[PDB]
């Protein structure tokens, strides 16, 4: 199906003396496989998945020299954004960088990402056309035209459209048992009556992968339904439930519609 | 695969 490889970075500055924390994590279709933390004694690129584990000594050395080079870049990015916003060194700020690849069922390139963020707000982001940038505030306009003159997106395009998809396809094959799977939501329903006049129907969806599901409450085929964010169970599958408070006796009116990639037929659940 | 090139802000 549609897979993806993303790289998430987090660099939080430490006020004064002390090395700021650098975080690097890699996800292959929402599955972590590598990690790096500047506050760990290993000082290397650590694997968090079996597929990437047996990649040889040359792989880890090259990746560690690059995560250390991405760190040296984020050290300068902290102080640079300090001057852009005219901030003092006594503060602590968070820089978030993410670039990745998206790929469909055809296993061809479709979208590429490369975006930054400073103190939780957007900064600069790579558009869908991969040749123009987006500046959030005024300080971001300084780096928008600094990267337009240096053609950074064409040099990034050679990665998003080139090397990154090749290694994404490689990572999918090495972990086929835990990557391309489409598990189906083991849906069920529960009935909790808060009083003798009303009751809370609840539509569950358990043990499904990927996280793409849709839970909608409809009465006789026809929005005040309590929906919670798709949460992980930990075993590699996700969960999600949608509940609506209904008057007692009208439970036959309401139906739940579960749609998922693994489900060939869109399910409709009834009490 | 981390991208071999690093770009400064």
């Amino acid at each position, epitope marked *: 199906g549609s897979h993806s490889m993303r790289y998430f970075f987090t660099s939080v500055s430490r006020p004064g003396r002390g090395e700021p924390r650098f975080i690097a994590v890699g996800y292959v279709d929402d599955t972590q496989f590598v990690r790096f933390d500047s506050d760990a004694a290993s000082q290397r690129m650590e694997p968090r998945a079996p597929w990437i584990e047996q990649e040889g000594p040359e792989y880890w050395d090259g990746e560690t020299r690059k995560v250390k*080079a991405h760190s040296q870049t984020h050290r300068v990015d902290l102080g640079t954004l300090r001057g852009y916003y005219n901030q003092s060194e006594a503060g602590s700020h968070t820089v978030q960088r993410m670039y990745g690849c998206d790929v469909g069922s055809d296993w061809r390139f479709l979208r590429g990402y490369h975006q930054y963020a400073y103190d939780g707000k957007d900064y600069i982001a790579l558009k869908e056309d991969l040749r123009s940038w987006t500046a959030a505030d005024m300080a971001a306009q300084t780096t928008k035209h600094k990267w337009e003159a240096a053609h950074v997106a064409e040099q990034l395009r050679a990665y998003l459209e080139g090397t990154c998809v090749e290694w994404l396809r490689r990572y999918l094959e090495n972990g086929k048992e835990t990557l391309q799977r489409t598990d189906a939501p083991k849906t069920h329903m529960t009935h909790h009556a808060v009083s003798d006049h009303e009751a809370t129907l609840r539509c569950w969806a358990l043990s499904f992968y990927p996280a793409e599901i849709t839970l909608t409450w409809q009465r006789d085929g026809e929005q005040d339904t309590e929906l919670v964010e798709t949460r992980p169970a930990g075993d590699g599958t996700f969960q999600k439930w949608a509940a609506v408070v209904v008057p007692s006796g009208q439970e036959q009116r309401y139906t739940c519609h579960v749609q998922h990639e693994g489900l060939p037929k869109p399910l409709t659940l009834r009490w | 695969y981390l991208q*071999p*090139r690093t770009f400064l802000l």
Partner: T-cell receptor
Amino acid sequence: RKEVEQDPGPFNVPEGATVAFNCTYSNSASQSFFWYRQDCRKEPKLLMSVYSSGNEDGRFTAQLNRASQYISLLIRDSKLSDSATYLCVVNRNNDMRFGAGTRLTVKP
Amino acid sequence: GITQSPKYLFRKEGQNVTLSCEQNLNHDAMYWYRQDPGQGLRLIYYSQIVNDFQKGDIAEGYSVSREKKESFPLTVTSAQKNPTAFYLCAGQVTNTGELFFGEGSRLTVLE
């Protein structure tokens, strides 16, 4: 082969002629490419940057083919000012790796 | 507009020598290449950020130190593989990748 391999040369062409350079890089993940000019006993000077689009800079035209991993420099109406060795520069990580170079000597 | 010193250099065999390389254009990184006839440019040392420095393809027998952003001295030690040789210093703009070299320093050994 090597990480950056070009033509052995040298190239001895008459004035005004067109000279074509070639370069093959082994690292498929490379993304920054440049053509550098270096005179005899001098330092290399950046001639132009290379992009997959194929940028034309007056008499100099550089083209890139990431598929075949090959870079070509084209110089038309070569003058005596062009007599130098032209180095093919490809990136490793952020460090640039230089090829052995090909020499162009223009005869008037 | 990076400046390397001295442009021409000579040192006896067994005597160490340091060639300086400062930059006034506020570059991002600094590199140390070398040129010998018959082969291309081979990387020696390079520093992406201040107080850091990484080895190159022929770093054995050389030593650098990036204690300041506007200096990156290379010390040609008693590594005997240095007869007449072109030692070059470069400065990179990480956004563009362009390498800006100094006028170069020619080191020759005399017995």
